[PDB]
Amino acid sequence: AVQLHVWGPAFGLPSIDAECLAAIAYLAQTLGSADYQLIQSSPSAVPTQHLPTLYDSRTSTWIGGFTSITAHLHAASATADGTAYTAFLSAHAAPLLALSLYVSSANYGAATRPAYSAVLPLPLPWTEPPAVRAAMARRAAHLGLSSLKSRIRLEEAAREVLDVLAEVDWAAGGGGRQVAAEVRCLAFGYLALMLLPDVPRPWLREIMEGRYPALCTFVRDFRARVFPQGGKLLPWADGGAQASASASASASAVALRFVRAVMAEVPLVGEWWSRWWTARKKREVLASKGAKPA
Amino acid sequence: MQIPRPLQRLFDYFPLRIYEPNELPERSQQLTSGDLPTLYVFSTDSDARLGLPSFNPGCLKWQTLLRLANLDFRILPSTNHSSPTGSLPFLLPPRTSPTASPAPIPASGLLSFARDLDLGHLDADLPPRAQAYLALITHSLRNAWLCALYLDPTHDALLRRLYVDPASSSRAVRAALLHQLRRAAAEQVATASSGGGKIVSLAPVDSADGIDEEAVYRSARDALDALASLLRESETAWFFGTERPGSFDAALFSYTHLMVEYMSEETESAKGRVSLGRMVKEAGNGELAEHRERMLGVAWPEWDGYRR
Amino acid sequence: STLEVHGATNTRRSLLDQIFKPVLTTLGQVLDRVGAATKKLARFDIFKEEGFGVFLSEVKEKSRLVFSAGTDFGNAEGSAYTNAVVRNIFGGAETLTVNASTGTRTRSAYNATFSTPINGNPDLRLSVEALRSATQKPWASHEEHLTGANLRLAWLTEKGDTHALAYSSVWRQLTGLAPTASPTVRADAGDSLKSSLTHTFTRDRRDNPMLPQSGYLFRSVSELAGWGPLNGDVSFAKTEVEASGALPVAIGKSGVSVGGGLRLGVLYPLPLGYSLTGAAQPSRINDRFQLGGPNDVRGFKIGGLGPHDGVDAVGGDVFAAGSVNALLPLPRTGPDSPLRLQLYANAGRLVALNSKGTDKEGKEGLAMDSAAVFKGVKSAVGKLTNGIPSLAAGVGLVYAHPVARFELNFSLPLVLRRGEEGRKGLQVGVGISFL
């Protein structure tokens, strides 16, 4: 009865963001084909404004984020390391992505821009991919590196994460430390979006394929197991992949999305409108959880 | 074609009677006289004389690390604008002459100036599993501290009496300072995806409605449980089987001490959200409060009166 | 005879009623009254300066919005601005808006000024400013982001002298200590409010305001920071006096005009309420006195000649600076264009405060009663007259442009206090009021 809201299946993976992709993998592993809908959407089309979002029709609840989604639908060193890696992936591993594929114009605009365009409506790609690039450029801070013999720094900033994720035994029946059933999906999502894309300017693919055999094998096995031939067999919306965004397909809705996005960018009266809109949407979200704001 | 400067060589010798220096003013002879290195933190004015812990977890870590390193220094309050970088906890060596002071030492090199026997246990490459938790402290508990202190109307008095009272002593400036503080806090907490990664127009979400006051608190509670479960595998009352506490114990103490001290009040108890101090005291069976109280036995042995 | 009916298109007759009301033996009385009336309508701003004339019995409004670009001069070689004036709203009122990026020294400004004449008289210009700035001060390495707003009241009487009763309240954030600064600056960065009440008197009786020849310029300033009624966080009492001069002697009427100058000042820290005794915190770096540069004392850098903390020039409570000008003419040219020679020997001392007289206080030494700071000021002024002053000399080629007195001098210092960074020749001054 639940209904997800994710990105597009562009890269051959059901999303182009590790959060919603991992949510999709989790739902596919735990629920069953006859429970969810995987409605494709965009961030501006949900009250949460955070894309991976559940919608449980039993009580009409909006639940943004991935950890809050897995909060619903639910020795001790196992779960302790589970939480530890759940928090270590959401930071220092998402900014390792955004060091490529989202900030470097040499790599963003050759595979990422058409991928984003092929999942959005007609007039919207004007404004939202800029917001997402700004977001991933903010997250890629605290790293000292930007769009760029100044190459060893890349190898170092990649090892400082792949070595922590290395001695983990991310998918098997025995080894170093078995983590959990949930966070494995998150690691799959992040390592997939770190390895699988076509990436016309690759610098992570060679490092991974030539230094960490466990990561490549883990990603390939997890993709071939639960996501057959691009995950098109997943229970997408009634129509199809592109036909998924039918609940917000009216020209009026897309026009409203575009005009909000452009009005929230004017010099001076933009910040106030953005704050007011975010406040109203959060009030709506809280009212969806049976709460009572002012 | 660059030739040297004029070579007439008669411009010199003109300064006739070079007299004695100019005897720096009053407000630069008491605040900067100095007999020992002078660490600058967010401490109070009374606490600065005895060396009590600060109330900024970014400076309590370095203050604790330096006290563990068997270094004798002073503590003076500051206001975060006077620092080689943007962040405050920097150190200043003492003066060699009343008209010269060596270069400041920022927060990234304090434990390099502190070297007397073995300063290796305080800055070393952690085990690969250790960072998996050192990222659990700096990114979940930090966002909890922020969202609880700055963006919580129940903790308005605490913020207003810690951060904006010793700043201006004027109302119309206190207001703008509080606003800038809360804006920077909401912007810094709304970046780590544990709290909220809402996507708006091309400007970070600096508002009390970008994050949600549920996910941060829940991730903080999970982080405290995981840290307690890691501590219960110690056998030496310190995290990684080490006799003397290193950088990890100090990094955790920085937040644990303040969460037990300031945000640890008993009010209605119906709101559901229990103060972070209670979560620290209840994580596991009390394994974190005991670690905290043991940290005040290698750092502040001559002090008493904590827990509130 | 003929009451006022002409020219009252935009302005009010009530305002024009009192400007010449007492028009009430026959040969030259009216000829003097018209000369008084035109000189009264001259210090206004509404009437147009071109056709400011009225025929013997038996103009129009200037504009409403006057933009401009211009380039002012505030002792910094670079500047800019964009005014937006409104030469009338109700009576003879006004407003204004300057956006002076100002280039070199400062980096912003926004002055939403609003003047007005009070009670008929056209001189009581009770301005109400609301300013803003972010000025860079490279002699004590930091910026300063003023965000104040004052309520000034000026009055120019019929003898050239002026007045002021400003009431400022600023914010004064020092937020620029990125490069190597001195710990005195670090111990001062922060905030303030500095709600004050000043008073500036100036009997400018000179002929060429950019090149004095026969006048004499007395000009006093008396600040008073937070105290008693007007509160804040800083508390002091600051005064400053200047007395320039110039006088020709003899040879034709060739310009010789030997002149001199002088500058005095004091900074007396005070208690913080309705008294003269009690705790008195010393002065900050926002309030102390700078003295140097090509303008006030030539031969030294733009912030030198004071208590130095290494490479940063913190201020000093009390000071005194003098000068001697020559202003000789060009060789075989005459009373031609303002390009004239110059010879000078600039002096001046600046020493800060200190106690050095009582150690029983021990803890929390940043508090002194009236007796302590009094003896400190006595010791400072005693140290002011023990030793040869700075006494730097040099020559320069003045250029008395109508707005800016370009100098292009070449000077050398003679008496220095070790660590004062005295300039050595080839400096290029510019400003409004030199020493």
Numbering used by the authors:
A (entry chain C): 2 to 75, 105 to 178, 237 to 382
B (entry chain A): 14 to 128, 139 to 289, 292 to 333
C (entry chain B): 47 to 70, 78 to 111, 132 to 324, 329 to 512
Question: What text does the study give?
Answer:
The cryoEM structure of the SAM complex in lipid nanodiscs was reconstructed from 179,509 particles and yielded a 3.4 Å resolution structure. The resolution was sufficient to allow ab initio tracing of a majority of the folds of all three subunits. Sam50 forms a 16-stranded transmembrane β-barrel with a single POTRA domain extending into the intermembrane space. Sam35 and Sam37 are located on the cytosolic side of the membrane, where Sam35 caps the barrel lumen of Sam50 and also interacts extensively with Sam37. The orientations of Sam35 and Sam37, as well as visualization of the lipid nanodisc, suggest that Sam35 and Sam37 interact peripherally with the outer leaflet of the membrane and residues 339–353 of Sam37 form an amphipathic α-helix that appears to interact with the membrane. In this structure, the highest resolution is observed for the Sam50 β-barrel and for Sam35, with lower resolution (and more flexibility) observed for Sam37 and the Sam50 POTRA domain. When the map is filtered to low resolution, the first of two predicted transmembrane α-helices in Sam37 is visible; however, it is not visible when filtered to high resolution. It appears that the relatively large size of the lipid nanodisc compared to the Sam50 β-barrel prevents optimal particle alignment and further resolution improvement.
The SAM complex facilitates outer membrane β-barrel precursor protein folding and insertion into the outer membrane. The SAM complex consists of one copy each of Sam50, which spans the mitochondrial outer membrane, and Sam35 and Sam37, which sit on the cytosolic side of the membrane. Sam50 forms a 16-stranded β-barrel which is minimally closed between strands β1 and β16. The structures of Sam35 and Sam37 reveal that they each adopt a GST-like fold, which is also completely different from the BAM lipoproteins.
